[PDB]
Design a protein around this nucleic acid. Structure first.
Lengths: 159, 58, 95, 248
RNA sequence: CACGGACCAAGGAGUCUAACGUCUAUGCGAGUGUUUGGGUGUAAAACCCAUACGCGUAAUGAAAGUGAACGUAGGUUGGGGCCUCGCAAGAGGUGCACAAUCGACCGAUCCUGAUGUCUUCGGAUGGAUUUGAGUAAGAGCAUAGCUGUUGGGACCCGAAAG
RNA sequence: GUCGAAUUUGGGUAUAGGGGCGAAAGACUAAUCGAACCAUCUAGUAGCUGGUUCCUGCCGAAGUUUCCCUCAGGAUAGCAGAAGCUCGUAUCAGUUUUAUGAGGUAAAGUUAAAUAUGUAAGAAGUCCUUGUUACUUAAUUGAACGUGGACAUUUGAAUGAAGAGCUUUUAGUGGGCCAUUUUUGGUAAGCAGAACUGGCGAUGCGGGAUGAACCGAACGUAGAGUUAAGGUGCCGGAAUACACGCUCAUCAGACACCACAAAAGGUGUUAG
RNA sequence: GUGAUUUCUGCCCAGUGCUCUGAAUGUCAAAGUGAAGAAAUUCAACCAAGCGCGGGUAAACGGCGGGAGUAACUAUGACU
RNA sequence: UUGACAUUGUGAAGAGAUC
RNA sequence: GAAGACAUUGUCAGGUGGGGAGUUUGGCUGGGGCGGCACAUCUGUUAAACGAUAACGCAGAUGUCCUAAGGGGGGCUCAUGGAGAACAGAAAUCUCCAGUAGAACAAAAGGGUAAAAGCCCCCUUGAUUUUGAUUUUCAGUGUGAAUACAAACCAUGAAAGUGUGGCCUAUCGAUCCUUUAGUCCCUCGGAAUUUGAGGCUAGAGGUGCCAGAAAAGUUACCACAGGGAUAACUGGCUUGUGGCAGUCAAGCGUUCAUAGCGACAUUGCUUUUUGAUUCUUCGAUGUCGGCUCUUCCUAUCAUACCGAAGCAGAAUUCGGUAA
RNA sequence: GGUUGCGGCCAUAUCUACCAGAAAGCACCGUUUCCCGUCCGAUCAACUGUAGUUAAGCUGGUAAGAGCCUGACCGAGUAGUGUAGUGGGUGACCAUACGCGAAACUCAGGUGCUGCAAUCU
């Protein structure tokens, strides 16, 4: 018959990353998670206690709860036509930070600098990010570089 | 007299009619699940800081 | 399986409220005890005419029973119950 | 294939042994076969025509106590002749009680034959199932017809036995044929050394036992049972040890 | 090349009721309901009315039983509207309803167990990741209507039977 | 066929409905017999078949989840309507971009795509300053929440937004089918089962001569103009147009889906 | 139940059934009985018929196999 | 088909600690 | 005259009783039946790189096992190969090297694990108590299994720490009734006492059809309401087969591949085979064969005219147009 | 710069064959009365730093070395794949249009980096 288990069909999913087997390195446990941090869930197949279901692999959530060995995680899960807000209990082997907030705070501070700097510079800030523009004009110099005429090439077997 | 048992066809299309509504998440979320030991102290932290101004505010 | 004849577990006597030594024996049924409300009722409905009025269960499946242990506090004589998983063999003994 | 014979033991698992004997007892009676495909509870046989699936069962009764059912599937017919071509499937089913296992007979059955006891070991299996008093050493048998009327099931499997070692024996004689009733002291093979116990047991098999020899039996004091026929007898009439079979 | 229908006229199918949910209108409103009854009358109408009684205003436990303010009926985030200033833009003051959230209060369950006493009664106090269809300046009662449900022949017609 | 006897038949008579009678057929018992006939209970019950009566306007589905002695049926959620409610610059989005995770199919021969997928791009913000606690610390140190001060619209990427949220209440449905891109069972199938999207059912219109699904395009009533897909010898509205080549077929060929054709032959004819 | 006459009606009483000048100390309700209790009541024994036990029964229902050996080419196979 | 209570009165024998 | 406190009669009680009555005689399902369990579950796969995903798809497993195989701690290293030692051999036991796990970890499969999660020792009962939050299958209901803390009380260890059964993914159960533990609490309502019974809280006894009725056949005498949602029967599609036609010629034939063939196989056709599906029809298309009679096809048996032979004639054989 | 203790990422750190290391520090090494542990002071334990050897550990250097790692308009705009057509092809499959875009192999270079604390002519 059919089988739907708790860890069912996770064969390749919890595997241990070839030549990364063995004991977990110890900066995993030196990392301090706080309420309001955003973290990414990648399971660690060697640590069974505190291990999230195969739905939460790769999902990203916020820390509402900090406890002895574990942290709280709020996920938004699609069921039916709506999103439910899930709370999860996971040990810090299965968590790590997501760098989008580190990079976001780096740009927040730079934006603070530029503005307050530009506050004595008479505005004209241009503090947004703008997409890659169409490339402006230019003049190539053929001097030293001569256009090399190319043409299609005949067919051959070469077997 | 067998039937047609399972299909997912039309289900994603019915899903977007009213279309995947959001958490409607709030300031001050619920403290369900928060550490009871932190939560006990947090009672008295707020309990004290309210009266903190009751000495100043009068 | 096999289990001890003794255990030190948490005991709540109002006297103890601490781990104390207990005496393990195996729970058993107890007498049918007529005059029970449900037997007094069932005696009445079976009277008269209309044959068997209540279901007669032929549907057994399980080949075993769960095992319940009886823990008496050696000190304050209070008791507890505790339940093991299903098993075909059980002895509270030794070996 | 124009016929199939389907045989099911329906037990956990004890009868996986004897299906080996069926193929042996299929081997004497010769006839003709096509294929054999096991099922979880037993064999599927496939035959040519319908005529051999009759001879398969005719010889299947005398060996083993089976009841058989039949169905049909007509694959076609030629509308000119009126003739018909069917696939005949015989479903054969056997009593789910294997030789030398512990049975508890319902009271109605017990007092309809010799008024035998409730505890019985199934001595031998043949065209009728035979039953033996472990202590009283009385004989009775349950024909295959009467078994299917009320379908009781065996109390304990042959795989549930423990090892015993016979200290001494005391014979009362009695035996009718082939048998010796005797009274025996017995200690469990694991129990003998480290502490002690002696279960003084009234048993069959009193001439077969040499002192200190090893014997298998059901130890009921330890054995947990959920059967209904067991809870209803009485607890003072049950022997604590039932001696079954001897090791060589 | 599935079923019904030759044609015409006339009949012909979601009704009533008892008990309720939501919604709307109306009278009064911590109440509300005159019609079981009595007075009366131009006489089955209309008009007038004493006593109760029903729901509501108090919940909670199986029960014995007990029973809602630490405080401007509390704090924090947001809130229509109003008030102040200002040319205005906007900021500040106050913030009903309402949504979130943490507290205080009553009851039940488990824990503690005071000045006291017919020496085993009494239960003060203080708790708790506990629990309730609760309090926290009342909103329900009556009639009417739409729609929905349950029981009734139950939208209409139809069995083999008993 | 039988026709002197187990014969034929009139009247009287006895046996009545779970009964009678039977030289036996479930035969006969008033055209009724595997339980007669008549009235009532009885408008018996039906998850099953058929029917269900006037217009027009606005909106508009489902054949799917879970549970059921559940599979010709219900409860539940989803889709839908109606009633509105608090509000209104505003949080959103079947979309991209930047940033950052997860994956182990195709190819490759441990590595690793394409398309899909999670999060973030700010005021519920940032920096400082000094308060609370019974938790935490070796600790005026942390955590969580706060007071005071400061930075407003290039406020922190693109585009868009017939406004955002909120609740109550109830109908129908719970037989689906096809095409595309993948795929299992099967020898294959107008066969069976899935995955994605689009359609048909519920939908006319122009084209495919014809046709539920293919191509174009979705519909108030008209007028003119311009086109879509398909066409322009005649039926047929529009070139017996123009340009360059190939083919002669004692069954030519003619436009997708689509109403099919092969291995390989042929001093057939053209070009390499 | 069989179906005139003639001629024969084999073997089988384990099963199912029927039957019994048969026997035992098993099981057995109601009433009575004895005990325990303040009482409701609990229990312990006893008990008929019936089944259980043993006998007869096939012109009762019905059944009449399997595995082996063994007679002067093979082979037949009276028998153990 | 059996047992018990009632109809149901009068009293003798012989075994069982009622037949 | 016979019989006699017995028969009889009445009321209870056991037994017997298809002579009779009432009822039942599962579900999915390439028709229904048998089988099976896709009916409660677990692993790999079917699955197309988040999650989700069907078939009576495929390979297997589950109803148990364990006072340690649970918990804590310590020391140590496996499979295997190589080189040595009386008996001793293809392997016993001992010793040193190399040894990324090729071993073991109760069981199915997959993950996980090396001063361990394994092997061996030492101590122990956290497999305890009170209950709330969370994940999973899902309606974000129940059950099962799990996750992380809190309040107690405890095991181990020098200690950090670790443990709420099994290294992880399965191994299980409502109402009603019966019973046990708990506080020694509540009620028996005219007021008390002792039994009895009933409650609150937490367990067990079982529903495998596993969200959970108490249940044998039969109809060829049959009945009803329906179904082409579904069989037998024509048609439609597929062609597995069946039957028919080409291509290469390994080879039979006196030599001789093509007079006459074809094996190996490959490419097609056939609806006069048998099947598969279940599209139309169950408010009916009258079912086999023969008789009678008409017509069409060509895949030519005879007749016509031709080409071929290993055709002298004769004869026969293969092809050609031809219905 | 060497060396030790505790580390961070966990092969650019491993593996294999040779070679050198002054001082200081590690280490080998001596001992068996107390702590304590064994079939055996080998392992662990405790004791001296005295009596010794840098032989091995270890640190470093070498190697057209196996391994590992970083880079390449290197394979390659290749394989594959998303979108589109009343495109082609009897069929299998194949071009074109707008896009995305690899991998082993080969070749070339690299062969540990570093934190706190002490310590050494």
């Amino acid at each position: 018959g059919k089988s739907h288990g708790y860890r069912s069909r996770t064969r390749y999913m919890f595997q241990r990353d070839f030549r990364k087997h063995g004991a977990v390195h110890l900066s995993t446990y030196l990392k301090v998670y706080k309420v309001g941090d955003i973290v990414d869930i990648k399971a660690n197949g060697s640590i069974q206690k505190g291990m999230p279901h195969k739905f939460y692999q790769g999902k990203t959530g916020v820390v509402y709860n900090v406890t002895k060995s574990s942290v709280g995680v709020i996920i938004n899960k699609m069921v039916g036509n709506r999103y439910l807000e899930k709370r999860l209990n996971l040990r810090v082997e299965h968590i790590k930070h997501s760098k989008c907030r580190q990079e976001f705070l780096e740009r927040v501070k730079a934006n603070a600098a530029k503005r307050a700097e530009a506050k004595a510079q008479g505005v004209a800030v241009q503090l947004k990010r703008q997409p890659a523009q169409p490339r402006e004009s230019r003049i190539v110099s053929t001097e030293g570089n001569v256009p090399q005429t190319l043409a299609p090439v005949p067919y051959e077997t070469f077997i | 007299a067998k039937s047609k048992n399972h299909t997912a066809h039309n289900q994603t299309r019915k899903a977007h009619r009213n279309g995947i509504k959001k958490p409607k998440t709030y300031k001050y979320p619920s403290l369900k699940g928060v550490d009871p030991k932190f939560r006990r102290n947090h009672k008295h932290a707020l309990h004290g800081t309210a009266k903190a101004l009751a000495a100043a505010k009068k | 399986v096999n289990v001890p004849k003794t255990r030190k577990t948490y005991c709540k006597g109002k006297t103890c409220r601490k781990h104390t030594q207990h005496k393990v024996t195996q729970y058993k049924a107890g007498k049918a005890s007529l005059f029970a409300q449900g037997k007094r009722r069932y005696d009445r409905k079976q009277s008269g005419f209309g044959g068997q009025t209540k279901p007669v269960f032929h549907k057994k499946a399980k080949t075993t029973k769960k095992v319940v242990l009886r823990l008496e506090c050696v000190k304050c004589k209070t008791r507890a119950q505790l339940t093991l998983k299903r098993c075909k063999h059980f002895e509270l003994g030794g070996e | 294939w124009r016929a199939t014979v389907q045989i099911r033991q329906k037990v956990p698992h004890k009868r996986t042994f004897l299906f080996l004997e069926q193929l042996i007892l299929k081997h004497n009676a010769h006839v003709d076969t096509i294929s054999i495909s096991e099922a979880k509870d037993g064999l599927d046989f496939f035959y040519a025509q319908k005529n051999h699936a009759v001879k398969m069962i005719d010889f299947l009764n005398a060996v083993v106590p089976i009841k058989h059912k039949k169905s049909e599937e007509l694959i076609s017919q030629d509308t000119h002749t009126g003739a018909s071509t069917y696939k005949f499937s015989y479903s054969v089913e056997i009593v789910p009680i294997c030789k030398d296992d512990l049975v508890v007979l319902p009271k109605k059955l017990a007092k309809s034959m010799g008024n035998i006891s409730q505890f019985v070991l199934c001595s031998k299996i043949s065209n009728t199932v035979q039953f033996m008093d472990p202590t009283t050493l009385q004989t009775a048998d349950l024909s295959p017809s009467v078994y299917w009327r009320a379908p009781f099931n065996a109390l304990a499997d042959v795989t549930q036995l423990v090892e015993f070692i016979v200290l001494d024996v005391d014979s009362t004689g009695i035996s009718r044929g082939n048998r010796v009733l005797a009274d025996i002291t017995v200690a469990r093979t694991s129990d003998l050394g480290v502490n002690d116990q002696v279960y003084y047991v009234r048993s069959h098999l009193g001439g077969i036992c040499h002192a200190g020899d090893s014997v298998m039996g059901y130890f009921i004091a330890n054995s947990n049972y959920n059967s209904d026929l067991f809870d209803g007898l009485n607890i003072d009439y049950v022997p604590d040890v039932v001696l079954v079979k001897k090791l060589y």
